[PDB]
Amino acid sequence: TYTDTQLLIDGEWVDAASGKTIDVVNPATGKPIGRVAHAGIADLDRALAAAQSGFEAWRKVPAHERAATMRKAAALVRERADAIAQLMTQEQGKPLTEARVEVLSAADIIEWFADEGRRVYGRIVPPRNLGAQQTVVKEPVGPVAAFTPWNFPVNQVVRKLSAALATGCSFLVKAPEETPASPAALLRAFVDAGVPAGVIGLVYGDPAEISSYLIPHPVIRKVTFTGSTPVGKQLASLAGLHMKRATMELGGHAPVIVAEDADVALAVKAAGGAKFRNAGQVCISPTRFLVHNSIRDEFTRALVKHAEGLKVGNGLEEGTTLGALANPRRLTAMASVIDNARKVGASIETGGERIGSEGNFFAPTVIANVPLDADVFNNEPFGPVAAIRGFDKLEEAIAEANRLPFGLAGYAFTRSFANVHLLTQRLEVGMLWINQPATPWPEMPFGGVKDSGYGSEGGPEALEPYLVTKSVTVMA
Amino acid sequence: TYTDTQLLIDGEWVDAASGKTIDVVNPATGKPIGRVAHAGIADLDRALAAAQSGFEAWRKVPAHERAATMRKAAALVRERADAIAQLMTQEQGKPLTEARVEVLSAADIIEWFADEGRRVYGRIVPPRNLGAQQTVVKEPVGPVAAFTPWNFPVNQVVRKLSAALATGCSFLVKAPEETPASPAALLRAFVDAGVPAGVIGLVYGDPAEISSYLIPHPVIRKVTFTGSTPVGKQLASLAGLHMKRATMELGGHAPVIVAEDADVALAVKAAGGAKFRNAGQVCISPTRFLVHNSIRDEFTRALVKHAEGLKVGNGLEEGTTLGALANPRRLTAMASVIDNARKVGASIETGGERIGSEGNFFAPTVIANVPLDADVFNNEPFGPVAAIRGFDKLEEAIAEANRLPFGLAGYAFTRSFANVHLLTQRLEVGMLWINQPATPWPEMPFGGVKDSGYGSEGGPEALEPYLVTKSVTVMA
Amino acid sequence: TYTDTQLLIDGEWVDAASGKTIDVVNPATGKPIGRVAHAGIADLDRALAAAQSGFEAWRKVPAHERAATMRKAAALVRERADAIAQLMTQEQGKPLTEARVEVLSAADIIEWFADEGRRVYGRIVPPRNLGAQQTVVKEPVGPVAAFTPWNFPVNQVVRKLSAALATGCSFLVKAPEETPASPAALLRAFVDAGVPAGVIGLVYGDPAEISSYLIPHPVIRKVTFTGSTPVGKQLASLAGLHMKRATMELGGHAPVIVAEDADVALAVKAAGGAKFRNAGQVCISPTRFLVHNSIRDEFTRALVKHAEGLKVGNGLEEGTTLGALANPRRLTAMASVIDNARKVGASIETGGERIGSEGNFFAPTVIANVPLDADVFNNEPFGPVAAIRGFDKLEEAIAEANRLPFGLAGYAFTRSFANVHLLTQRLEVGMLWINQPATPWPEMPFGGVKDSGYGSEGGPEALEPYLVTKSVTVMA
Amino acid sequence: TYTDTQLLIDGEWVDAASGKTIDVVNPATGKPIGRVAHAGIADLDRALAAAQSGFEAWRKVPAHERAATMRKAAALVRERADAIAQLMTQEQGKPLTEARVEVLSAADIIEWFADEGRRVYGRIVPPRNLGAQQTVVKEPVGPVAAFTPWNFPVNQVVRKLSAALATGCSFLVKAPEETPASPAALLRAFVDAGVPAGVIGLVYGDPAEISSYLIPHPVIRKVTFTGSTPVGKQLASLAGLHMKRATMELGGHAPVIVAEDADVALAVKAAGGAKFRNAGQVCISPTRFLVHNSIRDEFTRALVKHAEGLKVGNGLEEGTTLGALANPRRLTAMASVIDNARKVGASIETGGERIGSEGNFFAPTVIANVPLDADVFNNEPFGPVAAIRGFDKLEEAIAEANRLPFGLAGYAFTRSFANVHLLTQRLEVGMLWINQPATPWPEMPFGGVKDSGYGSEGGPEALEPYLVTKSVTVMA
């Protein structure tokens, strides 16, 4: 089974006013599995009024009470994690084992942010005149509009929602029409835990119509988007025209630097595992493997061996470790990336093809001998493709790593302090993981640089985009 | 004496390749006093290249060395304060005494920021696996494009410049064509102190063309603009379209709430004195005077008396306490504000006319019986005009204070703790001063909310728009 | 019912080696209710070995796991709060309603410290040479010896224990022989929640023999004591002789300043309620009431009215609001304080006598017209006695407030910002509460100044006495 | 030239009421050079009264004014660096070049602390009831009694003095009778800068009698001592008996771990150079050289060569790189250390004798084949003596590094990240420097663990022993 999804407005699950719905298909099959309410402008006016009213309510609830309510939502997300994961796998394609991991960590994230909300500290500044008190108070910015994409239906809502809620903001999210049930199950946990009516809202419909209406509207004080770099540029431009606070989490093109002193088995296990996680459909997925010439061939073979050991299948089989891609455009885009690679003289080491003629299954693919003008080494592939090149000198790996307008994550494998320290200072990324896969715990900052966007969704830094800082000076 | 001003590119004071200049007028007389170079695209290209190199240089200079270099520049600014102030008054209109105060407070800013650059701290997070070290590191964002207005020619530059230098970014500023010499003099103190070629640049010319070229350019990593709300919106739109970090300090419309228990005489002294400072051409200037009805008449008359005491004349003549407005557009703008007040039934209690027929002199003006639809109570007048309205309940004054889309500064006068705490919580402003005029020290955050923009220019918060946060996790 | 109490050593509840026990009496009755193991030196050697081994174990458990374990202990303390409170009332005398409040808030404290342990942050310092990394790491100091008194058997263990546990330290507490069962029930929750063997230890016996042995012993790296000022001086002296880190929470003598603009009903309700809480047996209990002459008489009558409305009785009756004093020396000391008051010419307004001839019931007592040489206005009474004097000028109240070598808490009632600000800057206390009773939440610092001791048991500051800070600089 | 030194009391350089003096010797010659006033109880009484008044004064001076005053003092210290260094070398023994370095680094300290005084921040805690404001405020503790040793006469004073002045405490120091003039000269820079009468005081005399009088005295709120472990224990015992805040910087015994992958030449240059700095009379001097057996012989010979290169002679003669030891007790102490090394079977590889028959000259000495029971490997030698021992496993070196009750500084040389991280975690020291000598900058914490005491003299942490934390909760 798989349920139809409704809008959440003012504490109620409701149909759109007009009754219109959008069909939802299972990517592993191509067959309808349900429908989602298609909101129009009238449903949006009701969500906005409600968000305003919810903000006036929520900002008055003391932080410790807000925290206890959020921890209650978290316990419910944990309990319902298998049922929610089954919804997710069906609508998005990832393996059930991966969906379960995603939802359980959603509960972890909520819990950390609930406690963070109690530690939004102000400051007292030693004054220039002892007869005055000089303070810096932090307070919530107001109603937030969030736009979240399909690759992690739950986890891309959960950080934004948790940070908003921990600060005293209300929250109105447009989630993906193609993966709508698992984000709605997340918000249902919050409604059941006692977050009052209007603090949270959820809508689905025509993405352009919704974002063009919410972002200029005077109820909304803060906008947050995660998605593609070109769509973000369009939304950050609209937000700027209406002077709205904005954060953006966009495309990455993560380099992997395998230094001469690297453990190779480890690199392959850690970066290769990470590459094929959610079929490469991750803003932090390692893409450009820069491997020292001394071990390049050995690395390339071991990666090929890892790709070929993946069990492609419908994500509901527990043994499936590579599911279908999320939707048919991902096939088109993977076909295009692989064509261009062949055309520019790269070698397709394994994979490189659609599997079957039903659903969106594409084969895990490793490209070697990749020239620098290849599409895969310039545009974000966002799919189950690795591209390998060699280097001699660590300084040339770093410059390659920094060549692109992205961005976001980077990985490396090395053992010397000197290399760790050099990669730390020089690599143009928001997050760098060395000798392990990505472990984006909620207490670590998470966000990009350059075209990958700005603002963090972890650590205390994650609260700041939702806060206003106010200087107060009172002469006694 | 008044000097002609050049562009600063890659260590060198130079003319524009085209040789073009713009005439500089003294607002007190209407008479030409000098000229400034009118930069074109070609000179911007050399500034941008120089900025790139300067960033590579300055990012490598240890913070304690950057700090000592910045502190020398500040010592130079102090040494040259009379000369700088003389240039400012001539080009901008303010009295010599206020110019000197601006220039000295510039030095105070540079010093605080010099020291703050040494305290851009990272952090170490207790890890989930004890074999890994989880750190968060702070780094400079990159080359900055800055755009600054004419109201405080030196001070609007210095906070942006100081922030950028303390973090290790390079800095390219477009300063006002109408007030070129005093900022160029500030920049010349930094060159003479030892800031290397390319780290700082200064251009003048057509503002639209400079903005449109610098903001989309891939060398610029971060944009900062101080100015009016409409231009900031156009600039933030563009920044967004090209995914640039942006901060904005825009229009204010500061309410002043004089409560039933206020010390009226202190209220007149503090907020009257602040009103006519720089002839009200200040983003935090008290404008909407909300006075409890019990003391409204007493307050109006005392404010009228304070306006009448002011000595209007040329800024070089000692005695002068209110100079000329900075340009002919401000006179037209004041007559419109006053014509509208009268049209809508308000009473001009004093002032309200041009003085003489040469230069930009406007009498200090107090308006009462102001209806809620008068231009002065909706648009930022940015001029030597106070508007007074009465209230009965503090709650009504608070709701009026929040009514407009602006939210920069707020003022109040009251003695009860409960009202301090209420005002602190409820007022939608970035900065609030109670029982005193504004004292915007560099250690205090300084920035807006709503249509007044975002990002702070004081406190440790002023460094954050100039920094990227990198999560680094290394497994042993 | 009421249970006999054992030692906790190495995960096991055990008798002392020798079999010796100490009888426990109910203060409301004077009758034996049980016994507690009397530890000797051999039991201490076993506790110390175990604490060493527990420290090596606990310091290796990642913080998030430590937190989850502590939150589990907390949920068990919450569930068992009524059963634990019944033990407490019996052995200590406080009303059951007060005992329940104490234990429930113990669970709150644990939960806040569990999350605090995850936020023990290090720092990265911008280096003087870019080739080095300069860091500040925080790590646990080691095995802690804690000595806790009888007035709040559970809450004086719980803060020390929680802070130790959140930092990675092991913990060995000597709890009170006269109130031993409710602290043992607290530690039992931690054992049941999965804190491993030896991380926590609990012993009872001859207070001088235990503290003389634990404090010099090389396993113990940190000592913490809460109790009387003269006993602390002796223990801080021993700790200093063996160079052991020490914190001390000692006697208070809390002033209450009721200013001329005070709400009187509120002052009486808030400070009077607080005075008779746990029969005045609290280091923060308001003792010296300094009331403005204009309302002194009205305050004195309303306090008398509050004291006379207390229902004296055995604490197990739900309606009892003043229980018996904790032990027979409290009667002797209250007899002495009241004698001296009468002798120096003070007036006993109500109470002043033992009630009955069984148990330790003393009457709630209010003394007025108190000269400055009266014992009650110099030595900490630690019992159900208030002492009232007048003042004319707020500055004279403050000097009186600051006259004594204590210390700890202070209270006031006033409405003006000016007074709030003056009391804030001038009053020599660790904690100041204004227009309310004490609400010592775990997120607020808690500790004294002067003879009241040093170190805080709340806020992040509470972790620092358990941490070592290490500067690390590594040249690449 | 060398000058006689006086007491500094309440703004005035004065003699002791008794008129007594102590002779000051030049350690390089044995010859008298001057005298210092020998303070008695009566002069201490005037210092204590003056300290009380000075505290009342300085606590009222806004932090930005305190900072500017401190920065002037620092500018004076720089101006007078040759003169101060001349006094130091004469009285203390170190070469002129090292004295000048000490004096200049003093100025650097004062400046950092000046700036840190402006950033003693309080905080605002999200409240449990929104009608209350919960703040935590920082205040100066009160008058300080400081006791400082002869090894860095100016530098051991300056950190304590700077900390105390930045927080707003007053300061009374007993400096070394054997090296009086250079600290008095430092204190004279603060008097000439404008620090008011009473805020700073300076006495000399009988150390025991001064200590016993100042520590129990009710004017003294905080004690700080730098010195040997046995005297610190006696002083901490007394501080404790009178419930005074105390910090202690005591004996160190720094291990140096040269790992199998070390750069041996850098190891010799960094830790050899640091060994003979101030002829090893430093609390963080490398002493126990633990060298991997593979490179031990290479290391020993290179260190012997570096010791042999040093130029022994009077500190005023240029060329001199190792001066005389500071007093005759240090010669006796070195002969004992060397007599014991030889008795226990170690080999003296170079040095190990007195040079000449006048003054306190000792040859730079390297000892190898050192058994674990030799005095040099258990007691702090505080002299120009390195002891070398080999190891096979890094784990054995780490367990030796931790074996002693001292734990001040530690050094290592290694290239692998895993060893940096291991050493960082496992070494029981306050400060660790890897691949470089010690660089104790004022922004880095500086303090011990175990028998080396407690409290930091660097970083923001250096201010915390000089501050009290006050929780303030005000209900509207």
Numbering used by the authors:
A (entry chain A), B (entry chain B), C (entry chain A), D (entry chain B): 5 to 480
Task: Quote the study's own text.
Among the eight ALDHs which have been tested for the conversion of 3-HPA to 3-HP, AbKGSADH was first discovered as an enzyme that catalyzed the conversion of α-ketoglutarate-semialdehyde (α-KGSA) to α-ketoglutarate (α-KG) in an alternative pathway of L-arabinose metabolism. Here, we report the first crystal structure of the 3-HP producing ALDH from A. basilensis (AbKGSADH) in its apo-form and in complex with NAD+ cofactor. As observed in many other ALDH structures, AbKGSADH forms a tetramer.
To elucidate the molecular mechanism of 3-HP producing ALDHs, we determined the crystal structure of AbKGSADH at a 2.25 Å resolution. The overall structure of AbKGSADH shows a conventional conformation for the ALDH fold. The monomeric structure of AbKGSADH consists of three domains: two core domains and one oligomerization domain (OGD). The NTD is composed of seven α-helices (α1–α7) and nine β-strands (β1–β4 and β7–β11), and forms the NAD(P)-binding Rossmann fold, where seven β-strands (β1–β2 and β7–β11) form a large β-sheet packed in the middle of the domain and other two β-strands (β3–β4) are located on the surface of the domain. The CTD consists of seven α-helices (α8–α14) and seven β-strands (β12–β18). The OGD (Val124-Pro144 and Tyr470-Val481) has two long β-strands (β6 and β19) and one short β-strand (β5), which are packed in a line and protrude from the NTD. Although there are two AbKGSADH molecules in the asymmetric unit of our present structures, the tetrameric structure can be easily generated by one of the two folds from the P4322 crystallographic symmetry operation. Dimerization is mainly mediated by the OGD and the CTD of AbKGSADH. Three β-strands in the OGD and a β-sheet in the middle of the CTD form big β-sheet, and tetramerization of AbKGSADH is mediated by the OGD and two α-helices (α2, α3).
